[PDB]
Structures are given as structure tokens and as C-alpha cells.
Amino acid sequence: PRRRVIGQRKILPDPKFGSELLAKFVNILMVDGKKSTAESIVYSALETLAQRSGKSELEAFEVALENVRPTVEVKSRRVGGSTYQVPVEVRPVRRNALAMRWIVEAARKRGDKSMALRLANELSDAAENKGTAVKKREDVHRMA
Amino acid sequence: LTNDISDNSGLGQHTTTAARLYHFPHGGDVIDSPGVREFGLWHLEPEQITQGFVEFHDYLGLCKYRDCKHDTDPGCAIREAVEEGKIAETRFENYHRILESMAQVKTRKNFSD
Amino acid sequence: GQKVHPNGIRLGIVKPWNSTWFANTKEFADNLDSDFKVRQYLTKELAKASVSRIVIERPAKSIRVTIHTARPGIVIGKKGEDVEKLRKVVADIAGVPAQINIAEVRKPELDAKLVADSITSQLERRVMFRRAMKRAVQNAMRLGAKGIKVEVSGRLGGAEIARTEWYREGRVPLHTLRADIDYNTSEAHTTYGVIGVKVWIFKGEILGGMA
Amino acid sequence: ARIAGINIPDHKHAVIALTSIYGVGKTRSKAILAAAGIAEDVKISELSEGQIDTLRDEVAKFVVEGDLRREISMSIKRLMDLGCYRGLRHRRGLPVRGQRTKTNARTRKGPRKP
Amino acid sequence: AKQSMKAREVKRVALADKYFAKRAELKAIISDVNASDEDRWNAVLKLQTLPRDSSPSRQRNRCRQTGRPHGFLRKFGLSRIKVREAAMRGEIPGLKKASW
Amino acid sequence: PRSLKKGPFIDLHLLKKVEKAVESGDKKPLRTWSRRSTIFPNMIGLTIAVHNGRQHVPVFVTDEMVGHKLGEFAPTRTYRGH
RNA sequence: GUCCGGAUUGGAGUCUGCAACUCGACUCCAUGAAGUCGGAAUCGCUAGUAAUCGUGGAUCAGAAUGCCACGGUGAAUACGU
Ligand SMILES: [Mg+2]
Ligand SMILES: [Mg+2]
Ligand SMILES: [Mg+2]
Ligand SMILES: [Mg+2]
Ligand SMILES: [Mg+2]
Numbered sequence: 001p002r003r004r005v006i007g008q009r010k011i012l013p014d015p016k017f018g019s020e021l022l023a024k025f026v027n028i029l030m031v032d033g034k035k036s037t038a039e040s041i042v043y044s045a046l047e048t049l050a051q052r053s054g055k056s057e058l059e060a061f062e063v064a065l066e067n068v069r070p071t072v073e074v075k076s077r078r079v080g081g082s083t084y085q086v087p088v089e090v091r092p093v094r095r096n097a098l099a100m101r102w103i104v105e106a107a108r109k110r111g112d113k114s115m116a117l118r119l120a121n122e123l124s125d126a127a128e129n130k131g132t133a134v135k136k137r138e139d140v141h142r143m144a
Numbered sequence: 145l146t147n148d149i150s151d152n153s154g155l156g157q158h159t160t161t162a163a164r165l166y167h168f169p170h171g172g173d174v175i176d177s178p179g180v181r182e183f184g185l186w187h188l189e190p191e192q193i194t195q196g197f198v199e200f201h202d203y204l205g206l207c208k209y210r211d212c213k214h215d216t217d218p219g220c221a222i223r224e225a226v227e228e229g230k231i232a233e234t235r236f237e238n239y240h241r242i243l244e245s246m247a248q249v250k251t252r253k254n255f256s257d
Numbered sequence: 258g259q260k261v262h263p264n265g266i267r268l269g270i271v272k273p274w275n276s277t278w279f280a281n282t283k284e285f286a287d288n289l290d291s292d293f294k295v296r297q298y299l300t301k302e303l304a305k306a307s308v309s310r311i312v313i314e315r316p317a318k319s320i321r322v323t324i325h326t327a328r329p330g331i332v333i334g335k336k337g338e339d340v341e342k343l344r345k346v347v348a349d350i351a352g353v354p355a356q357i358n359i360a361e362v363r364k365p366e367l368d369a370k371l372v373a374d375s376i377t378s379q380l381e382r383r384v385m386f387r388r389a390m391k392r393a394v395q396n397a398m399r400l401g402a403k404g405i406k407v408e409v410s411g412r413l414g415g416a417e418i419a420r421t422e423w424y425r426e427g428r429v430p431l432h433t434l435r436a437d438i439d440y441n442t443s444e445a446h447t448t449y450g451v452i453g454v455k456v457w458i459f460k461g462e463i464l465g466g467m468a
Numbered sequence: 469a470r471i472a473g474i475n476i477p478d479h480k481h482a483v484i485a486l487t488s489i490y491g492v493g494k495t496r497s498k499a500i501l502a503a504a505g506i507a508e509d510v511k512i513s514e515l516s517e518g519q520i521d522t523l524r525d526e527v528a529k530f531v532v533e534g535d536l537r538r539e540i541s542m543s544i545k546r547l548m549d550l551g552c553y554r555g556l557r558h559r560r561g562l563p564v565r566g567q568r569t570k571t572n573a574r575t576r577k578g579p580r581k582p
Numbered sequence: 583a584k585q586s587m588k589a590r591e592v593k594r595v596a597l598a599d600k601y602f603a604k605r606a607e608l609k610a611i612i613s614d615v616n617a618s619d620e621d622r623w624n625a626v627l628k629l630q631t632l633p634r635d636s637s638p639s640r641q642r643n644r645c646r647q648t649g650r651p652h653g654f655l656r657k658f659g660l661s662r663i664k665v666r667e668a669a670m671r672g673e674i675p676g677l678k679k680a681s682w
Numbered sequence: 683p684r685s686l687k688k689g690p691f692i693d694l695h696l697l698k699k700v701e702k703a704v705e706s707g708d709k710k711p712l713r714t715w716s717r718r719s720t721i722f723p724n725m726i727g728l729t730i731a732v733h734n735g736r737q738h739v740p741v742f743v744t745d746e747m748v749g750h751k752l753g754e755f756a757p758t759r760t761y762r763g764h
Numbered sequence: 765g766u767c768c769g770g771a772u773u774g775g776a777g778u779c780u781g782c783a784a785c786u787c788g789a790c791u792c793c794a795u796g797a798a799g800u801c802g803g804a805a806u807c808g809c810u811a812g813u814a815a816u817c818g819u820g821g822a823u824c825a826g827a828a829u830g831c832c833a834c835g836g837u838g839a840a841u842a843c844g845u
């Protein structure tokens with residue numbers, strides 16, 4: 001957008017929890033438009049996360065992403081005429097996506113034989129501010 | 145006799161401004177040429193400079209990256225070759241600096257073909 | 258840049274085809290071959306009748322050819338003799354019962370084919386081209402044309418370097434599909450080389466679709 | 469366990485562990501198994517020798533392991549001996565079946581050489 | 583192209599049509615099951631005695647106005663070039679620029 | 683492979699030449715262009731000068747060559763290296 | 765380096781075609797390279813898009829990983845110049 005700053009479109013709630021954030025999560029996790037595989041993975045991971053965290057699995061997802069959501073991040077600027085880093089705050093809608101993105105990549109790196117398990121394990125460690133998802137969040141805060 | 149003036153301070157004068165042939169006493173011919181300041185090589189292609197360094201043919205095709213610029217690209221054979229002293233460090237640095245010099249003198253849009 | 262053929266793009270909107278028969282893929286190719294050679298034969302034979310277009314329509318057992326000429330009495334000769342002769346000829350080429358029905362063009366100065374071939378006939382007679390094109394455009398618009406553009410390309414006046422010369426007057430809106438823009442191309446072979454002329458003649462927007 | 473031929477099969481589904489032998493692949497393996505009556509999902513461990521000997525008997529019918537290696541080597545050696553086109557391309561070390569050799573014939577020429 | 587090429591094409595077709603019946607019958611005898619291998623042998627020997635330019639697989643569709651051996655279109659029998667002229671001039675019936 | 687229902691292939695001019703050669707005894711190398719024909723059992727021990735496209739190279743037929751085309755023994759490209 | 769990967773090669777075939785040696789496509793059995801996400805650098809894409817999944821057509825006896833078309837599933841992001 002040089003001329004028209006177009007508004008973002010709306011995502012549809014998930015048919016299992018009506019949660020916009022869950023739908024955004026599965027859209028981020030999706031690969032090659034295979035939505036069904038992604039929803040299977042996410043529901044499996046959420047339910048096992050529920051088993052470890054007891055009640056309120058959707059809420060557990062909320063607090064998991066909360067424990068690793070970023071507040072301040074470095075941003076590049078060429079106004080000086082040379083590359084210039086600056087610490088800037090992040091809008092809530094964007095830090096939601098950043099947290100979701102960091103979670104999914106971290107899960108893929110985890111391995112251990114199943115995406116369902118990787119996602120659940122990363123979420124479970126995220127719920128308690130651990131699993132290296134928080135560490136990646138902590139390092140980009142330190143870079144302020 | 146050819147004109148001969150002594151140098152002053154950092155560099156010498158340009159006495160001989162001509163190129164003259166002279167018949168060698170025993171056999172053959174020599175040619176006196178005017179002094180030069182910059183023998184820059186922007187007309188030459190960058191590959192022709194790698195060919196010009198004769199101590200580099202011993203390592204062509206030994207770099208894992210085929211388009212190996214040989215400066216810091218991984219697996220540059222001549223890099224390690226100069227690490228162990230097979231190649232003259234000064235020669236490697238000169239090669240790099242004349243390459244980067246060609247970038248400075250490529251500003252002109254005139255043609256050299 | 259290049260421009261789409263004006264006649265070829267207005268076929269759906271304002272221009273009728275010049276061969277309106279129907280046939281399935283079994284004998285489509287040879288129909289085209291036969292009609293191509295017959296119309297080229299007619300052009301070669303009526304190089305003086307000043308023909309503009311040779312439309313061809315085929316009944317299942319017959320071939321019907323309609324000539325658009327500016328000199329009807331010429332092509333029909335005397336008592337329709339030569340027209341019957343060439344009807345026999347097209348019967349030979351098509352191998353099919355033939356019928357020829359000539360048609361006249363009332364404003365020969367309003368026919369891109371006619372004016373283009375006239376320009377070329379002048380050029381090959383070694384006349385200064387600017388005179389030719391400007392006379393053509395003046396005549397056309399004197400006969401009430403909404404616009405006309407003439408274009409000549411080649412070794413004009415035996416030039417060592419070929420130049421492009423055009424001359425427009427009136428309105429010639431190529432981009433408007435609704436426009437009745439008649440276009441045709443001719444070539445003149447001189448000692449220096451071959452010179453190409455193109456003629457656009459815009460006769461008015463045709464409101465109300467094809468019909 | 470031990471099966472005919474020098475190689476020792478590992479402990480996994482029979483159809484798969486049988487492929488270890490040089491002369492047997494997935495279809496020939498299930499053929500051998502069906503002929504011996506042993507199912508596929510069985511493992512090589514937990515499989516009494518009473519059927520192991522039957523397996524080796526049925527694999528004895530087909531050419532396998534070293535004898536196959538010698539047979540293919542004789543066939544290529546014969547090809548080279550004729551002096552036929554394929555023989556030449558075999559002793560030259562080049563694609564034999566008409567593949568493009570102007571580029572990307574590496575599988576038979578080895579790594580790029582200067 | 584060169585007149586030689588168009589002449590070659592017309593000769594090839596004028597021989598293929600001639601020997602069509604014989605070639606068909608002979609190929610029948612050859613591929614025919616239950617055929618005595620001596621009859622099949624005589625047929626496969628006789629087949630190569632016919633002019634090699636009798637096999638239809640040996641012809642090449644050329645532009646029916648220029649003889650161009652490339653960009654051919656069976657529906658019209660012209661190369662990819664002359665089809666465009668005929669179309670833009672309104673000679674190919676019902677042919678127009680497509681858009682969808 | 684050609685087929686089995688059609689049997690091997692050979693052009694009959696080579697067939698006539700080879701039968702007239704064998705029935706007549708030892709002969710000069712047969713000068714043929716038919717790279718497409720296949721070696722039959724009867725032509726064993728013969729010598730065929732088969733065209734490589736610029737020259738007829740000699741090929742001394744052995745029983746091992748049976749079941750193969752003649753062209754397989756007349757390379758058509760010269761190459762030595764770079 | 766696997767029940768990944770399928771290259772390569774041996775053996776045996778089918779079909780088209782006068783004719784598959786050079787030099788076709790395909791099938792079967794066998795074989796199972798490199799390859800474990802790719803340096804500097806660089807490309808495409810703002811929504812039914814990218815990504816992914818197949819299907820068809822032209823040319824054409826035969827010979828598509830190309831081309832031209834068709835639908836299925838179907839995102840992320842855009843503060844700003
Ligand atoms: Mg300047
Ligand atoms: Mg255009
Ligand atoms: Mg297999
Ligand atoms: Mg010509
Ligand atoms: Mg062909």
C-alpha cells in the first residue's frame with residue numbers, strides 16, 4: 001500500500017469454539033490449503049493441552065499465547081540514510097499474529113514424531129512461560 | 145640519451161612522454177614507454193582477473209559453491225589455500241581490492257569494446 | 258506499439274464476415290482453401306473492375322459469390338458475358354455449381370480497399386506521395402466521412418532510409434468498438450521497393466448493436 | 469534372524485525385512501510370504517524356525533544375493549565384450565539408455581570435475 | 583517453403599492414397615493372430631518392398647498457402663500465421679477474438 | 683523391442699544378400715546400409731561392412747551378436763575428449 | 765538415508781510405425797545414487813490470490829516435467845513511502 005491503506009478482511013469463527021483466534025491459529029498452521037489436516041492437528045493439540053491443563057482448553061490456549069505475546073520489538077528505518085533500528089510497541093492484533101507464528105514454527109522445530117504433540121508440548125510450555133517460545137519473545141524484548 | 149629527472153618527495157616526474165623503439169645491441173628490440181600512474185582494469189571482465197592470477201588455476205572447480213566469488217563464500221578452495229600459505233596473502237588481497245576497484249570505475253557509461 | 262486489426266476486432270460488434278457458410282471440421286479446411294484460391298483468382302482477374310470485397314456464401318450444393326465493385330458495367334462486360342465466363346471459372350475452381358451476383362459501391366471514395374489500391378496505383382506511377390494521400394483524405398471527407406486516416410510506409414520517393422508518413426483528418430476512434438471504422442491494406446511494388454498503405458475510414462458510431 | 473544368503477534380516481514386518489536380501493523386492497517378497505503362508509505383518513523375530521526354513525526354501529527357488537550379483541556382472545561384461553554401443557557406454561561410464569549427456573548426467577559420471 | 587517441399591508432400595500423399603488398400607491388407611495379415619508365421623513372414627517382407635513414401639505416417643501437414651511445416655492447425659489447414667490474416671480479414675466463418 | 687507377435691525384423695535385400703553369400707561359401711564383406719536389420723543365426727561367421735553414415739565399418743558376426751541390430755556395432759559419433 | 769527418495773543399471777515385455785541400434789513411449793521383476801531443506805544473492809504473489817491437488821486440449825502414427833486451458837482445497841500480510 002503506497003496510495004490506499006486497505007483494511008484487513010474478517011476470518012470466520014471456528015466451528016468447534018466460535019473463537020476468531022482459534023481460526024486465525026489454524027489459518028497460520030495450515031499448509032498448502034489443507035485446512036482439514038490443520039483443524040485435526042489443532043483440535044488434537046488443544047484437547048491434550050486440556051488434559052494437562054484440566055478445564056477450559058480454549059482459555060488455556062488464550063493464556064498460553066498470552067505468556068509469550070510480544071510487547072516491544074526492533075523496527076528498521078532508512079530515514080537516517082543508513083539502516084537504523086528503533087524499539088517500537090506492537091498493536092494487539094499484530095502481536096496476536098506474532099505470538100501464533102512463533103508458536104507454530106517452534107512446534108515444527110520440536111519434532112518428537114508428531115505435530116499434534118509438538119503443538120501441544122509447545123503450548124503447554126508456553127502456558128507456563130517456557131519451551132523457548134518465551135525465550136525467543138524475551139530476546140526480541142532485550143533487543144529494545 | 146633519454147631524459148632523466150630525479151624524483152621529488154612522494155613520486156617522480158613524467159620525463160619520457162613518448163614510446164620509442166630501440167635496436168638491441170646483440171639482437172632484438174626494446175621500447176621505452178612513458179611512465180604510468182594507474183593501470184586499472186575495468187575493461188577486463190571479473191573472471192579474466194581470476195584467470196590472470198596464475199596461482200589460482202590450481203583451485204578452480206574445488207569450491208563447493210560453483211559461482212564462488214572466493215572472498216567469504218563457504219568452501220572457497222583458494223581461501224583455505226591462502227590460510228595454509230599455499231597462496232601469497234598479498235596476492236589474494238590485491239585480487240580482491242582490484243575487483244572492488246572495478247566497481248568504483250564502472251560508473252562511466254562509455255564503452256570499451 | 259502494435260495495434261489490433263480494426264476489422265478483425267469489430268466482427269462481433271459492427272463488421273460482418275466475408276464468408277458466411279457453415280461446415281463442420283470434416284471439410285472446413287478445404288472450404289477455406291477453395292474460397293481463398295477463388296477470391297485470389299477473382300482479384301487477379303478483376304484488377305481493373307475496382308473490386309472492394311468478395312463475399313462468399315455457400316448453400317449446401319452451391320457456391321454464391323458477391324462482388325462489391327465501383328464499376329458494375331465493367332465486370333459484367335457486355336450482356337453479362339464475361340461474368341458468366343468467370344462464373345464457369347469459379348465453378349471449375351470450387352468444383353461446385355456457382356452463382357455470381359455483383360454489387361456496386363456508391364461512394365468509391367469511401368472504401369478503404371478502393372482508396373488504398375488507388376493510392377498504390379498512383380505510387381507505382383511515380384507520383385509524389387504526399388499529394389496522393391492528402392488528395393485521398395480531402396476527397397473522402399468531401400464526400401461526408403466522419404474521419405479518415407491514411408498511412409504510407411516504405412522507401413517514399415526512393416528514400417535510402419524507409420520512413421513512415423500518415424495524415425489524419427476528422428475522427429478515427431479505433432478504441433471505440435461501436436465505431437464503424439472500415440480498414441484495408443494495399444502494397445505497391447516500385448523499382449526502389451514495396452510501399453505499404455493503410456486506410457482507416459470512420460463513417461459514424463453504429464448505435465444499436467450488430468443489426 | 470538367519471535366512472538364506474549371507475545377510476541377516478532385521479526384526480520388523482516380514483514383507484519389509486525380507487527385502488533386505490539383494491535379489492528380493494516388495495512384490496517378490498509378498499509372493500514368497502504367500503507361498504510360505506506366513507502373513508506379512510508378522511515380524512522376523514517371534515517366528516519359529518519351522519517356517520524360517522520354509523522361507524529359505526522358497527527363496528532358494530529365485531536367484532538372490534551373490535549369485536544374482538555375479539549374473540548381472542557377467543551380463544555387463546558380455547555387453548562390453550560384444551563391442552556393442554551399450555558395451556562402449558558401459559566401459560566409458562556414461563548413460564546407457566540414451567539419456568541426455570550434454571548436462572545433468574551426474575549419476576553415472578560422478579561429481580563435477582574441473 | 584521451397585517448391586521442392588510442396589512437391590514432396592503432394593507426391594507422398596498421391597502414393598499413400600494409392601497403396602492404402604494394399605498396405606492395410608498387408609498389415610492385417612501381419613498383426614493377425616492365427617496367421618501362419620510363414621504368411622506373416624512373407625507379408626512383413628513384402629511390406630518393405632512398397633515405396634516407403636506410401637506410409638501415411640511419413641507425411642507432414644504443411645500450410646496450405648505457404649507450406650510452412652510448423653504451427654499447423656488441422657481445423658483450417660493453415661500455419662499459425664495465415665490463420666491470423668484470414669481471421670482478422672473476416673474469411674474464417676464465425677471466427678473471432680475470444681475473451682472470457 | 684519390436685514385438686513378439688511380429689518376430690524380428692530384417693529388410694529382404696539384406697536377406698537375399700546373406701543367403702546368396704552363405705550358399706556360395708566365403709564372400710567379401712557385405713556392403714550394406716541397413717543398420718535397422720537384426721542379426722539372425724544364419725549370418726554367424728560372416729563379415730558385414732555396415733554403414734556408420736560416412737563409411738562401412740567391418741563387423742565379424744559371432745553367435746553372441748545374434749538377436750541384436752547391426753547398427754549396434756557401427757558407432758556413428760567420433761569422440762576422444764577435451 | 766527409513767516401508768523417505770527415486771536416479772541409475774540388469775533381465776523380460778507391450779504398442780505405434782516400412783523401421784524404435786544410434787534415438788520412442790509405456791509395463792513387469794530386479795537394482796535403490798545424490799539427497800536429511802540448500803552460501804552470497806535472487807524470484808513470484810494483495811483473495812478465490814499465493815500454495816497445493818488433479819483433469820483436459822492443441823501439435824501429433826507414436827512421442828509433454830513444456831505450452832494453452834479447467835476445476836478442488838484454500839491461506840498469511842500490508843504500520844508506511
Ligand atoms: Mg560521469
Ligand atoms: Mg497486441
Ligand atoms: Mg519395483
Ligand atoms: Mg517461394
Ligand atoms: Mg509426423
Ligand SMILES: [Mg+2]
Pocket residue numbers: none
Ligand atoms: Mg518408496
Ligand SMILES: [Mg+2]
Pocket residue numbers: 796
Ligand atoms: Mg531405501
Ligand SMILES: [Mg+2]
Pocket residue numbers: 800
Ligand atoms: Mg529425517
Ligand SMILES: [Mg+2]
Pocket residue numbers: none
Ligand atoms: Mg487452480
Ligand SMILES: [Zn+2]
Pocket residue numbers: 207212213214215219220221222223
Ligand atoms: Zn573459492
